[PDB]
Amino acid sequence: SGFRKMAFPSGKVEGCMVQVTCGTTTLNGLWLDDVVYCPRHVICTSEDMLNPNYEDLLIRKSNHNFLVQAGNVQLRVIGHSMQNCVLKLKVDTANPKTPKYKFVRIQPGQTFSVLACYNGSPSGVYQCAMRPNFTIKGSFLNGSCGSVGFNIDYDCVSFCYMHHMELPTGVHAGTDLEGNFYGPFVDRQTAQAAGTDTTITVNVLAWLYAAVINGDRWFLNRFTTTLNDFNLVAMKYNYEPLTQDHVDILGPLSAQTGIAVLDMCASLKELLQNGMNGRTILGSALLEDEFTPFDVVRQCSGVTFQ
Amino acid sequence: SGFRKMAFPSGKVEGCMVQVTCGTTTLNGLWLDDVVYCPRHVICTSEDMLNPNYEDLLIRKSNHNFLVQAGNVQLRVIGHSMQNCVLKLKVDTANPKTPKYKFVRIQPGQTFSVLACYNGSPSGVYQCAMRPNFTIKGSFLNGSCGSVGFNIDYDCVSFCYMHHMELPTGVHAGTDLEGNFYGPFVDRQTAQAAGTDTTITVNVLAWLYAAVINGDRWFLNRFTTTLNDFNLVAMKYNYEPLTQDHVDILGPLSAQTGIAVLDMCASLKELLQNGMNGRTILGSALLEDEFTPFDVVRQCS
Ligand SMILES: [Cl-]
Ligand code: NA
């Protein structure tokens, strides 16, 4: 029992973190096989930030303009190329600690672990979700650019996020490992702002099922709802629409607990109406939305505490 | 910016986790140098656990009663002994991945990272605190015994917790790596319960400082207080007494933010007395107490 924000063990990613320096700028890179991946804005100087032309900035660089440091070892750069907003530096040494890995682009609502790094050295690990507005609510200080997000289901590291920048509200924007931003954001320091964010409804429902699995039912009620009536209510609280895909995804948790998905929807509607009246759910006084259905199955017992 | 519950990177510990089997019981062990550490209750049957004589059960056991598996490699057990509630299995091979490490017993209110493991395989990492009642609010399923908690200082891992049991309220109890329990608990199937818990005041204050550093200021007020007056309030609300040492430890955050600890205590005093008024602090509707002053400084600075 218990329920925690649970990250993946970070060691497989720790062994891939390096420091990349260009000019006066230092940030983190990801060393897989003989390639180091990092944000292309490492090649920007002070002036360059408003309207950089990365093609023009990059053509002026030689391989030896890139300093890559793996712990105490200088790695020799022997080639470079840009893919979208990621710089790829070919180095003369394949990383002997390279895990089994793949690159995946995720959808809003998906979760992942972040290994926050500074100067190529890992500092801490935490869980994040891709918000509906394509930002993440990270914890990142100056120098964290190039830190990555990942999952490790079944001994393979799926890299899904590389950190590029902070927006004015203090949330974070970045790319997949092919260098394509999540959301409409760009690696320019022109004014940009996260949209109005919303609550990830399918994840709240998953976490309510987690609460039932762990033995608590106080928030259920005798009612049900249609999917459309649920969405009409939930959107008034700035919840994301629940789709039939989401309903299908929740099937296994519904089966394990014996609570129909639309009956859990009725419970959620009532929680939004009533609050918790001084109670908590899995240790929280608010409805939590950064655990996915898959996360709940990963962490919770397959046997409900009835 | 931002503020997250954050664990230490777990790689140095992942390289130390192994599977230990005795009879039909499988759990996790910690492999450092040429010794594997695990809960001594690995040697017990379910019958034994009602009233185990660990001395007698262990003298019955021999090296060949233990199967230690590091990934796919079997480690040969060449000795065995007990230290308090921890079993020590000498193996013929020193762990080449052994980090610089110490065994450190922590105090209530201090935090640590937990590497949750099953069948010797790391599964997840999370952060938690030693509660004032010496339990931890972990997340553990059957097979997690022997999972460890730790902190890192530079390159040195300070191991502070090994997981032994779940209590009836679903919180968890265990030992330091020398086998000494945290809290008034024993490794036998007998009636046991978590005592009434209290909130870790110095950590709540630390988290209020973190909230200020991150731009959450609505709870600040013009008032200050004294230790004596605040501690009468803390007692009322089942908060741990605030000591002068706690005030001193918070000094840095006091200097950085301009809110003296007794100034922030006046905020906390008011939050206890009046509630949050529908507002949140750092995205929480509760007062969070599992961030230490060190944790805040490390993450914010
Ligand atoms: Cl996805
Ligand atoms: Na004040």
Coordinates of C-alpha atoms and ligand atoms in Angstrom, one line a residue:
Chain A
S1 CA 0.0 0.0 0.0
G2 CA 0.8 3.7 -0.2
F3 CA 0.9 5.8 -3.3
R4 CA 3.8 8.1 -4.3
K5 CA 4.9 10.2 -7.2
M6 CA 7.2 7.4 -8.4
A7 CA 10.0 8.0 -10.9
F8 CA 11.9 5.4 -12.9
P9 CA 15.4 4.4 -11.5
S10 CA 17.6 6.9 -13.2
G11 CA 20.9 5.0 -13.6
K12 CA 20.6 4.1 -17.2
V13 CA 20.1 7.8 -18.1
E14 CA 22.8 9.0 -15.6
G15 CA 25.4 7.1 -17.7
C16 CA 24.4 9.1 -20.7
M17 CA 24.7 12.7 -19.3
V18 CA 27.5 14.9 -20.6
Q19 CA 28.4 18.6 -20.6
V20 CA 28.4 20.5 -23.9
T21 CA 30.1 23.9 -24.2
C22 CA 30.0 26.3 -27.2
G23 CA 31.5 29.7 -26.6
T24 CA 30.5 30.9 -23.2
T25 CA 27.5 28.6 -23.1
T26 CA 27.4 25.3 -21.2
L27 CA 24.5 22.9 -20.9
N28 CA 23.7 19.2 -20.9
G29 CA 23.8 16.7 -23.6
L30 CA 22.7 13.1 -24.0
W31 CA 25.4 10.6 -25.2
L32 CA 23.9 7.6 -26.9
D33 CA 26.3 5.4 -29.0
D34 CA 28.6 7.9 -30.8
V35 CA 26.1 10.8 -30.9
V36 CA 25.6 13.6 -28.3
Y37 CA 22.2 15.3 -28.5
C38 CA 21.6 18.8 -27.1
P39 CA 19.5 21.9 -27.6
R40 CA 20.7 23.8 -30.7
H41 CA 20.5 27.1 -28.8
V42 CA 23.9 26.2 -27.3
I43 CA 25.2 28.0 -30.4
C44 CA 23.4 31.3 -29.5
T45 CA 25.2 34.2 -28.0
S46 CA 23.6 37.1 -26.1
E47 CA 22.4 39.0 -29.2
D48 CA 21.3 35.9 -31.0
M49 CA 18.3 35.1 -28.8
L50 CA 15.5 37.2 -30.3
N51 CA 15.8 36.1 -34.0
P52 CA 18.5 33.5 -34.4
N53 CA 19.1 31.9 -37.8
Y54 CA 20.4 28.6 -36.7
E55 CA 21.6 27.6 -40.2
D56 CA 23.8 30.7 -40.4
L57 CA 25.0 30.3 -36.8
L58 CA 25.9 26.6 -37.3
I59 CA 27.7 26.9 -40.7
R60 CA 30.3 29.1 -38.9
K61 CA 31.1 26.3 -36.4
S62 CA 33.9 23.7 -36.7
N63 CA 33.8 20.4 -34.9
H64 CA 36.4 21.7 -32.5
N65 CA 34.2 24.6 -31.5
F66 CA 32.2 22.0 -29.5
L67 CA 33.7 20.9 -26.2
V68 CA 32.0 17.7 -24.9
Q69 CA 33.0 16.5 -21.4
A70 CA 32.0 13.1 -20.0
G71 CA 32.9 13.2 -16.4
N72 CA 36.6 14.0 -16.6
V73 CA 37.1 12.8 -20.2
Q74 CA 37.1 15.3 -23.1
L75 CA 35.2 13.6 -26.0
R76 CA 36.4 14.5 -29.5
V77 CA 33.7 15.9 -31.8
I78 CA 34.1 14.6 -35.4
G79 CA 30.9 15.8 -37.0
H80 CA 27.8 17.8 -36.4
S81 CA 24.3 18.3 -37.8
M82 CA 21.0 19.9 -36.8
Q83 CA 17.7 18.1 -36.8
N84 CA 14.9 20.5 -36.1
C85 CA 15.8 22.1 -32.7
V86 CA 18.4 19.5 -31.6
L87 CA 22.1 19.6 -32.3
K88 CA 23.7 16.2 -32.9
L89 CA 27.4 15.9 -32.3
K90 CA 29.2 12.8 -33.6
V91 CA 32.0 11.9 -31.2
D92 CA 34.9 9.5 -31.7
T93 CA 33.9 7.2 -28.8
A94 CA 30.7 5.3 -28.5
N95 CA 29.2 5.5 -25.0
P96 CA 29.9 2.1 -23.4
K97 CA 27.0 2.7 -20.9
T98 CA 24.4 3.2 -23.7
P99 CA 21.2 1.4 -22.6
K100 CA 18.6 -0.2 -24.8
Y101 CA 16.7 2.9 -25.9
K102 CA 14.2 4.4 -28.3
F103 CA 12.9 7.9 -29.0
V104 CA 9.1 8.4 -28.6
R105 CA 7.0 11.5 -29.0
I106 CA 4.3 11.6 -26.3
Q107 CA 0.8 13.1 -26.1
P108 CA -0.6 15.5 -23.5
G109 CA -1.5 13.7 -20.3
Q110 CA 1.4 11.3 -20.6
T111 CA 3.9 11.1 -17.7
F112 CA 7.7 10.7 -17.5
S113 CA 10.7 10.9 -15.3
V114 CA 13.0 13.9 -15.5
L115 CA 16.7 13.7 -14.6
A116 CA 17.6 17.3 -13.8
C117 CA 21.2 17.9 -14.6
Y118 CA 23.7 20.8 -14.3
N119 CA 27.1 20.9 -16.0
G120 CA 26.6 17.3 -17.2
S121 CA 26.1 16.0 -13.6
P122 CA 22.7 14.6 -12.4
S123 CA 21.1 16.5 -9.5
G124 CA 17.8 14.8 -8.9
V125 CA 14.9 12.9 -10.4
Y126 CA 11.2 13.7 -10.4
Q127 CA 7.9 12.8 -12.2
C128 CA 6.3 15.2 -14.7
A129 CA 3.3 15.1 -17.1
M130 CA 2.9 16.7 -20.5
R131 CA 0.2 19.3 -19.7
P132 CA -2.7 19.8 -22.1
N133 CA -1.1 23.1 -23.1
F134 CA 2.1 21.4 -24.0
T135 CA 4.2 22.7 -21.1
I136 CA 5.6 20.7 -18.2
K137 CA 5.7 21.9 -14.6
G138 CA 9.3 21.1 -14.0
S139 CA 11.9 22.2 -11.5
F140 CA 14.7 23.6 -13.5
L141 CA 17.4 26.2 -12.7
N142 CA 19.8 28.0 -15.0
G143 CA 22.0 25.4 -16.7
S144 CA 19.4 22.6 -16.8
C145 CA 18.9 22.9 -20.5
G146 CA 19.4 19.5 -22.2
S147 CA 18.1 17.5 -19.2
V148 CA 15.8 14.8 -20.5
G149 CA 12.6 13.0 -19.7
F150 CA 12.1 9.3 -20.1
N151 CA 10.2 6.2 -19.2
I152 CA 11.7 2.8 -18.6
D153 CA 8.9 0.3 -19.1
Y154 CA 10.4 -3.2 -19.6
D155 CA 14.3 -2.5 -19.5
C156 CA 14.2 -0.1 -22.5
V157 CA 14.6 3.6 -22.0
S158 CA 12.1 5.6 -24.0
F159 CA 13.4 9.2 -24.2
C160 CA 10.5 11.6 -24.8
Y161 CA 11.6 15.1 -23.7
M162 CA 14.6 17.4 -23.8
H163 CA 14.5 20.6 -21.9
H164 CA 14.9 23.9 -23.8
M165 CA 13.4 26.8 -21.9
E166 CA 11.3 28.5 -19.3
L167 CA 8.2 30.4 -20.0
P168 CA 7.0 33.5 -18.1
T169 CA 4.8 31.6 -15.7
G170 CA 7.7 29.4 -14.6
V171 CA 6.6 26.3 -16.5
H172 CA 8.8 24.6 -19.1
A173 CA 9.0 23.9 -22.8
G174 CA 11.0 21.5 -24.8
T175 CA 11.3 19.0 -27.6
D176 CA 11.2 15.3 -28.3
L177 CA 14.6 13.8 -29.2
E178 CA 14.0 14.5 -32.9
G179 CA 14.1 18.1 -31.9
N180 CA 10.4 18.9 -32.6
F181 CA 8.9 21.1 -29.9
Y182 CA 5.9 20.1 -27.9
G183 CA 3.3 22.8 -28.5
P184 CA 3.6 26.0 -30.5
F185 CA 6.9 27.1 -28.8
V186 CA 10.1 28.1 -30.6
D187 CA 13.7 28.4 -29.4
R188 CA 13.6 32.2 -29.6
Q189 CA 13.4 34.7 -26.7
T190 CA 10.5 36.6 -28.3
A191 CA 7.4 36.9 -26.1
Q192 CA 5.7 33.5 -25.8
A193 CA 3.2 32.3 -23.2
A194 CA 1.6 29.0 -22.1
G195 CA -2.1 28.8 -22.9
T196 CA -4.8 28.4 -20.3
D197 CA -4.1 25.0 -18.9
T198 CA -6.7 22.4 -18.0
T199 CA -6.9 19.3 -15.7
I200 CA -6.1 15.9 -17.2
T201 CA -9.5 14.2 -16.5
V202 CA -8.5 10.7 -17.5
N203 CA -5.6 10.8 -15.0
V204 CA -7.8 12.1 -12.2
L205 CA -10.1 9.1 -12.8
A206 CA -7.1 6.8 -12.8
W207 CA -6.0 8.2 -9.4
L208 CA -9.5 7.8 -8.0
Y209 CA -9.3 4.1 -9.1
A210 CA -5.9 3.9 -7.3
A211 CA -7.6 5.2 -4.2
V212 CA -10.2 2.5 -4.4
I213 CA -7.6 -0.2 -5.0
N214 CA -5.8 1.0 -1.9
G215 CA -9.0 0.7 0.1
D216 CA -10.9 4.0 0.2
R217 CA -14.4 4.5 -1.2
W218 CA -15.7 7.5 0.7
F219 CA -16.1 9.7 -2.5
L220 CA -18.3 7.3 -4.5
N221 CA -22.0 7.9 -4.8
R222 CA -25.2 6.1 -6.0
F223 CA -25.3 7.9 -9.4
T224 CA -24.1 7.5 -12.9
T225 CA -23.7 9.9 -15.9
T226 CA -23.7 9.9 -19.6
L227 CA -20.4 10.7 -21.1
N228 CA -21.8 13.9 -22.6
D229 CA -23.3 15.1 -19.4
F230 CA -20.0 14.4 -17.7
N231 CA -18.1 16.5 -20.1
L232 CA -20.6 19.4 -20.0
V233 CA -20.1 19.5 -16.2
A234 CA -16.4 18.9 -16.1
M235 CA -15.5 21.5 -18.7
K236 CA -17.1 24.1 -16.3
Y237 CA -14.2 23.3 -14.0
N238 CA -11.6 23.6 -16.8
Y239 CA -11.2 19.8 -17.0
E240 CA -10.2 18.3 -20.4
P241 CA -12.9 16.5 -22.3
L242 CA -13.1 12.8 -21.6
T243 CA -13.2 10.8 -24.8
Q244 CA -14.3 7.2 -25.6
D245 CA -10.6 6.4 -25.9
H246 CA -10.2 7.5 -22.3
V247 CA -13.2 5.4 -21.2
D248 CA -11.7 2.3 -23.0
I249 CA -8.2 3.0 -21.4
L250 CA -9.9 2.9 -17.9
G251 CA -11.5 -0.5 -18.6
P252 CA -8.9 -2.6 -16.7
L253 CA -9.1 -0.4 -13.6
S254 CA -12.9 -0.5 -13.8
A255 CA -12.7 -4.3 -14.0
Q256 CA -10.4 -4.7 -11.0
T257 CA -12.5 -2.5 -8.8
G258 CA -16.0 -3.3 -10.0
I259 CA -16.7 0.4 -10.5
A260 CA -18.0 1.3 -14.0
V261 CA -16.1 4.1 -15.7
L262 CA -19.2 6.3 -15.9
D263 CA -20.0 5.6 -12.3
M264 CA -16.5 6.9 -11.4
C265 CA -17.2 9.9 -13.6
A266 CA -20.3 10.6 -11.4
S267 CA -18.1 10.4 -8.4
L268 CA -15.7 13.0 -9.9
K269 CA -18.6 15.3 -10.8
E270 CA -19.7 15.2 -7.2
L271 CA -16.1 15.8 -5.9
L272 CA -15.9 18.9 -8.1
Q273 CA -19.2 20.1 -6.6
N274 CA -18.5 19.3 -3.0
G275 CA -14.8 19.3 -2.3
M276 CA -13.4 16.8 0.2
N277 CA -14.9 18.2 3.5
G278 CA -11.6 18.0 5.3
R279 CA -10.7 14.5 4.0
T280 CA -7.9 13.5 1.8
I281 CA -7.5 11.0 -1.1
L282 CA -4.1 9.2 -1.3
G283 CA -2.7 11.9 1.0
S284 CA -3.8 14.8 -1.1
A285 CA -6.4 17.5 -0.5
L286 CA -6.7 18.3 -4.2
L287 CA -7.6 16.1 -7.2
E288 CA -4.3 14.8 -8.6
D289 CA -3.9 14.6 -12.4
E290 CA -0.3 13.5 -13.1
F291 CA -0.8 9.7 -12.7
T292 CA -1.9 8.0 -15.8
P293 CA -4.0 4.8 -16.0
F294 CA -0.8 3.0 -16.9
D295 CA 1.0 4.5 -13.9
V296 CA -1.7 3.3 -11.5
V297 CA -1.5 -0.2 -12.8
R298 CA 2.4 0.0 -12.6
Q299 CA 2.4 1.1 -8.9
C300 CA -0.8 -0.4 -7.3
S301 CA -1.5 -3.9 -6.3
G302 CA -3.4 -6.1 -8.7
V303 CA -5.6 -7.0 -5.7
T304 CA -8.1 -4.4 -4.5
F305 CA -8.3 -3.8 -0.7
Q306 CA -12.1 -4.4 -0.5
Chain B
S1 CA 12.0 27.7 -11.2
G2 CA 9.3 25.3 -10.1
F3 CA 9.3 23.0 -7.1
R4 CA 9.0 19.3 -7.2
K5 CA 9.4 16.4 -4.8
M6 CA 12.8 15.2 -5.9
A7 CA 14.8 12.1 -5.3
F8 CA 18.5 11.6 -5.6
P9 CA 19.7 9.9 -8.8
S10 CA 19.6 6.2 -8.0
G11 CA 22.2 4.8 -10.3
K12 CA 24.8 4.2 -7.6
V13 CA 22.3 2.2 -5.6
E14 CA 20.8 0.3 -8.6
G15 CA 24.2 -1.4 -9.1
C16 CA 24.0 -2.8 -5.6
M17 CA 20.6 -4.5 -5.6
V18 CA 20.4 -8.3 -5.7
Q19 CA 17.8 -11.0 -5.1
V20 CA 18.1 -13.2 -1.9
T21 CA 16.2 -16.4 -1.6
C22 CA 15.9 -18.6 1.5
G23 CA 13.4 -21.5 1.2
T24 CA 10.3 -20.2 -0.4
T25 CA 11.0 -16.5 0.5
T26 CA 12.5 -14.2 -2.0
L27 CA 13.3 -10.5 -1.3
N28 CA 16.0 -7.9 -2.0
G29 CA 19.5 -7.5 -0.7
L30 CA 22.1 -4.8 -0.8
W31 CA 25.5 -6.0 -2.2
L32 CA 28.5 -3.9 -1.1
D33 CA 32.1 -5.0 -1.1
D34 CA 31.8 -8.8 -0.5
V35 CA 28.7 -8.8 1.7
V36 CA 24.9 -8.8 1.0
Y37 CA 22.6 -7.2 3.5
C38 CA 18.9 -8.1 3.8
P39 CA 16.2 -8.4 6.4
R40 CA 16.8 -11.3 8.8
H41 CA 13.1 -12.4 8.5
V42 CA 14.1 -13.9 5.1
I43 CA 14.9 -17.0 7.2
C44 CA 11.5 -17.4 8.6
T45 CA 8.5 -19.5 7.6
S46 CA 5.0 -18.1 8.2
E47 CA 4.8 -20.4 11.2
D48 CA 8.1 -19.0 12.5
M49 CA 7.0 -15.4 12.1
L50 CA 4.4 -15.6 14.9
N51 CA 7.2 -16.1 17.5
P52 CA 10.6 -16.4 15.9
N53 CA 13.8 -17.4 17.8
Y54 CA 16.2 -15.8 15.3
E55 CA 19.2 -17.2 17.1
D56 CA 17.9 -20.7 16.8
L57 CA 16.6 -20.4 13.3
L58 CA 19.9 -19.0 12.1
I59 CA 22.2 -21.5 13.7
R60 CA 20.0 -24.1 11.9
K61 CA 20.7 -22.3 8.6
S62 CA 24.0 -22.8 6.7
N63 CA 25.6 -21.0 3.8
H64 CA 24.0 -23.3 1.2
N65 CA 20.5 -22.3 2.5
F66 CA 20.8 -18.9 0.7
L67 CA 20.6 -18.2 -3.0
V68 CA 21.9 -14.8 -4.0
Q69 CA 21.4 -13.6 -7.6
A70 CA 23.0 -10.5 -9.2
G71 CA 21.0 -10.2 -12.4
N72 CA 21.6 -13.6 -14.0
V73 CA 24.8 -14.4 -12.1
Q74 CA 24.6 -16.6 -8.9
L75 CA 26.8 -15.3 -6.1
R76 CA 28.3 -18.0 -3.9
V77 CA 27.6 -17.5 -0.2
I78 CA 30.6 -18.3 1.9
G79 CA 29.5 -17.0 5.3
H80 CA 26.5 -15.8 7.2
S81 CA 25.9 -13.8 10.4
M82 CA 23.3 -11.5 11.9
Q83 CA 23.6 -7.9 13.1
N84 CA 20.4 -6.9 15.0
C85 CA 17.6 -7.4 12.5
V86 CA 19.8 -7.6 9.4
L87 CA 21.3 -10.7 7.9
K88 CA 24.8 -10.5 6.4
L89 CA 25.8 -12.9 3.7
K90 CA 29.5 -13.0 2.8
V91 CA 29.9 -13.8 -0.9
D92 CA 33.0 -14.9 -2.8
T93 CA 32.9 -11.8 -5.1
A94 CA 33.2 -8.1 -4.2
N95 CA 30.7 -5.9 -6.0
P96 CA 32.7 -4.1 -8.6
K97 CA 30.0 -1.4 -8.7
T98 CA 30.3 -0.7 -5.0
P99 CA 30.1 3.1 -4.5
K100 CA 31.7 5.1 -1.9
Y101 CA 29.3 4.7 1.0
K102 CA 28.5 4.9 4.7
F103 CA 25.8 3.5 6.9
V104 CA 24.0 6.5 8.6
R105 CA 21.1 6.4 11.0
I106 CA 18.7 9.3 10.4
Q107 CA 16.5 11.4 12.7
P108 CA 12.8 11.9 12.5
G109 CA 12.0 14.7 10.1
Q110 CA 14.9 13.9 7.8
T111 CA 14.2 12.9 4.2
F112 CA 15.7 10.2 2.0
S113 CA 15.2 8.6 -1.4
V114 CA 13.8 5.1 -1.6
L115 CA 14.7 2.7 -4.4
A116 CA 11.7 0.3 -4.5
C117 CA 12.8 -3.1 -5.8
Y118 CA 11.2 -6.5 -6.5
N119 CA 13.1 -9.8 -7.1
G120 CA 16.4 -7.8 -6.9
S121 CA 15.3 -5.5 -9.8
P122 CA 14.9 -1.7 -9.1
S123 CA 11.4 -0.7 -10.0
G124 CA 11.0 3.0 -8.9
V125 CA 12.4 5.8 -6.9
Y126 CA 10.6 8.2 -4.6
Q127 CA 11.3 10.6 -1.8
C128 CA 10.0 10.3 1.7
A129 CA 10.6 11.4 5.3
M130 CA 11.2 9.6 8.5
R131 CA 8.0 10.5 10.3
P132 CA 8.0 11.6 14.0
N133 CA 6.3 8.3 14.8
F134 CA 9.3 6.5 13.0
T135 CA 7.1 5.2 10.2
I136 CA 7.5 6.1 6.6
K137 CA 4.6 6.7 4.2
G138 CA 6.1 4.5 1.5
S139 CA 4.7 2.8 -1.6
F140 CA 5.5 -0.9 -1.3
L141 CA 3.9 -4.2 -2.5
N142 CA 4.7 -7.8 -1.6
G143 CA 8.3 -8.6 -2.4
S144 CA 9.7 -5.1 -1.7
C145 CA 11.4 -6.1 1.6
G146 CA 15.1 -5.2 1.5
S147 CA 14.5 -2.1 -0.6
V148 CA 16.7 0.6 0.7
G149 CA 16.6 4.4 1.4
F150 CA 19.6 6.6 1.0
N151 CA 21.0 10.1 0.5
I152 CA 23.9 11.2 -1.6
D153 CA 26.7 13.7 -0.6
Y154 CA 29.0 14.3 -3.6
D155 CA 30.0 10.8 -4.6
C156 CA 29.2 9.1 -1.2
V157 CA 26.0 7.2 -0.7
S158 CA 24.6 7.4 2.8
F159 CA 22.4 4.3 3.3
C160 CA 19.9 5.0 6.0
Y161 CA 16.9 2.6 5.6
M162 CA 16.1 -1.0 4.8
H163 CA 12.5 -1.9 4.3
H164 CA 11.0 -4.7 6.6
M165 CA 7.3 -4.5 7.0
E166 CA 3.9 -2.9 6.4
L167 CA 1.7 -1.8 9.4
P168 CA -2.1 -2.1 9.4
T169 CA -2.6 1.5 8.4
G170 CA -0.5 0.9 5.3
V171 CA 2.5 2.8 6.4
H172 CA 5.9 1.1 6.6
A173 CA 8.6 0.2 9.1
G174 CA 12.2 -0.8 8.8
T175 CA 15.8 -0.5 10.1
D176 CA 19.0 1.3 9.5
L177 CA 21.6 -0.8 7.6
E178 CA 23.0 -2.0 11.0
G179 CA 19.7 -3.6 11.6
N180 CA 18.3 -1.3 14.2
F181 CA 14.6 -0.5 13.8
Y182 CA 13.3 2.9 13.5
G183 CA 10.5 3.1 16.0
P184 CA 9.1 0.6 18.5
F185 CA 8.6 -2.2 16.0
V186 CA 9.8 -5.8 15.8
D187 CA 10.2 -8.3 13.0
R188 CA 7.5 -10.7 14.1
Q189 CA 3.9 -11.2 13.1
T190 CA 2.4 -9.7 16.3
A191 CA -0.1 -6.9 17.0
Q192 CA 1.7 -3.6 16.0
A193 CA 0.5 -0.2 15.1
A194 CA 1.8 3.2 14.1
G195 CA 1.5 5.7 16.9
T196 CA -0.3 9.0 16.5
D197 CA 1.8 11.1 14.1
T198 CA 2.7 14.7 14.2
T199 CA 3.7 17.2 11.5
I200 CA 7.3 18.2 11.0
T201 CA 7.2 21.9 11.8
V202 CA 10.7 22.8 10.7
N203 CA 10.0 21.2 7.3
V204 CA 6.7 23.1 6.9
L205 CA 8.5 26.3 7.5
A206 CA 11.2 25.3 4.9
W207 CA 8.5 24.7 2.4
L208 CA 6.9 28.1 3.1
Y209 CA 10.3 29.6 2.3
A210 CA 10.4 27.6 -0.9
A211 CA 6.9 29.0 -1.8
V212 CA 8.1 32.5 -1.2
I213 CA 11.2 32.0 -3.3
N214 CA 8.9 30.8 -6.0
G215 CA 6.6 33.8 -5.8
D216 CA 3.8 32.5 -3.5
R217 CA 3.5 35.3 -0.9
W218 CA -0.2 35.5 0.0
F219 CA 0.3 34.0 3.5
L220 CA 2.9 36.6 4.6
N221 CA 1.8 39.1 7.2
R222 CA 3.2 41.9 9.3
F223 CA 3.3 39.9 12.5
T224 CA 6.0 38.1 14.3
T225 CA 5.9 35.7 17.3
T226 CA 8.0 34.0 19.9
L227 CA 9.0 30.4 20.2
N228 CA 7.0 29.9 23.4
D229 CA 3.8 31.3 21.9
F230 CA 4.2 29.5 18.7
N231 CA 5.0 26.2 20.4
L232 CA 1.7 26.5 22.4
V233 CA 0.0 26.7 18.9
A234 CA 2.1 23.8 17.5
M235 CA 1.1 21.6 20.5
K236 CA -2.6 22.5 19.9
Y237 CA -2.3 21.3 16.2
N238 CA -0.1 18.2 16.8
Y239 CA 2.9 19.9 15.2
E240 CA 6.4 19.0 16.5
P241 CA 7.8 21.6 18.9
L242 CA 10.0 24.2 17.2
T243 CA 13.4 24.4 18.8
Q244 CA 16.1 27.0 18.7
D245 CA 18.2 24.7 16.5
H246 CA 15.4 24.6 14.0
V247 CA 15.4 28.4 13.9
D248 CA 19.2 28.4 13.4
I249 CA 19.0 25.9 10.5
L250 CA 16.4 28.0 8.8
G251 CA 18.5 31.2 9.2
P252 CA 19.8 31.1 5.6
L253 CA 16.2 31.1 4.1
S254 CA 15.4 33.8 6.6
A255 CA 18.2 36.0 5.4
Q256 CA 17.5 35.3 1.7
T257 CA 13.8 36.1 1.8
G258 CA 13.7 38.8 4.5
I259 CA 11.2 36.8 6.6
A260 CA 12.6 36.0 10.0
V261 CA 11.8 32.4 11.1
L262 CA 9.6 33.9 13.8
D263 CA 8.1 36.1 11.1
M264 CA 7.3 33.0 9.0
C265 CA 6.1 31.3 12.2
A266 CA 3.5 34.0 12.5
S267 CA 2.4 33.1 8.9
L268 CA 2.3 29.4 9.9
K269 CA 0.5 30.2 13.2
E270 CA -2.2 32.0 11.1
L271 CA -2.5 29.2 8.6
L272 CA -3.0 26.7 11.4
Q273 CA -5.6 29.0 13.1
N274 CA -7.5 30.1 10.0
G275 CA -6.8 27.7 7.2
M276 CA -5.8 28.5 3.6
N277 CA -9.0 30.3 2.6
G278 CA -9.4 28.3 -0.6
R279 CA -5.9 29.1 -1.7
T280 CA -3.0 26.8 -2.5
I281 CA 0.7 27.0 -1.7
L282 CA 3.1 25.5 -4.3
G283 CA 0.2 23.7 -5.8
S284 CA -0.9 22.0 -2.6
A285 CA -4.0 22.4 -0.4
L286 CA -2.2 20.9 2.6
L287 CA 0.9 22.1 4.5
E288 CA 3.7 20.0 3.1
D289 CA 6.2 18.6 5.7
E290 CA 8.5 16.3 3.7
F291 CA 11.0 18.9 2.5
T292 CA 13.8 19.7 4.8
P293 CA 15.6 23.0 4.9
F294 CA 18.5 21.3 3.1
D295 CA 16.1 20.0 0.4
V296 CA 14.8 23.5 -0.2
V297 CA 18.2 25.1 -0.5
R298 CA 19.5 22.3 -2.7
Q299 CA 16.5 22.5 -5.1
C300 CA 16.0 26.3 -5.1
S301 CA 19.7 27.5 -5.0
Ligands
CL1 CL 1.8 9.1 -25.3
NA2 NA 4.8 37.7 9.6

